[PDB]
């Protein structure tokens, strides 16, 4: 039941794939983190694919999306496809 949590401040896109069985953060990917400092939604996918590629490395297939105060915006979108296109299903 790994719970997914995507954070976005302004120009920083992040996704934290935690374990919702035992509070355990396993994977965390970010566009501005790895190196890519261009757009936020443009790479957002590529960020979700690397994330989903990460989380996947653990075997995280389905996730619990409970970002919280995060309205379905662009980032979470392109990022969510990445994460969902890569392997995660939340």
Curated annotation (Swiss-Prot):
GO molecular function terms noted in the UniProt entry: 5S rRNA binding; structural constituent of ribosome
Keyword Phosphoprotein: no
Keyword rRNA-binding appears in the UniProt entry: yes
Keywords linked to the UniProt accession: Ribonucleoprotein, Ribosomal protein, RNA-binding, rRNA-binding
Any one GO BP annotation for this protein: translation
UniProt feature coiled coil, ranges: none
Family under the similarity heading: Belongs to the universal ribosomal protein uL18 family.
Name of the featured protein: Large ribosomal subunit protein uL18
Phylogenetic classification of the source organism: Bacteria, Thermotogati, Deinococcota, Deinococci, Thermales
Full protein segment contained here: 23 to 112 of 112
């Amino acid at each position: 039941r790994l719970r997914l949590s995507v954070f976005r401040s302004l120009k920083h896109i992040y996704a934290q794939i935690i374990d919702d069985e035992k509070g355990v953060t396993l994977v965390s990917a970010s566009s501005l983190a790895l190196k890519l400092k261009g757009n936020k939604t443009e790479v957002a996918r590529q960020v979700g694919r690397a994330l989903a590629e990460k989380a996947l490395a653990l075997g995280i297939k389905q996730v619990a999306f409970d970002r919280g105060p995060y309205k379905y915006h662009g980032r979470v979108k392109a990022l969510a496809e990445g994460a969902r296109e890569g392997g995660l299903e939340f």
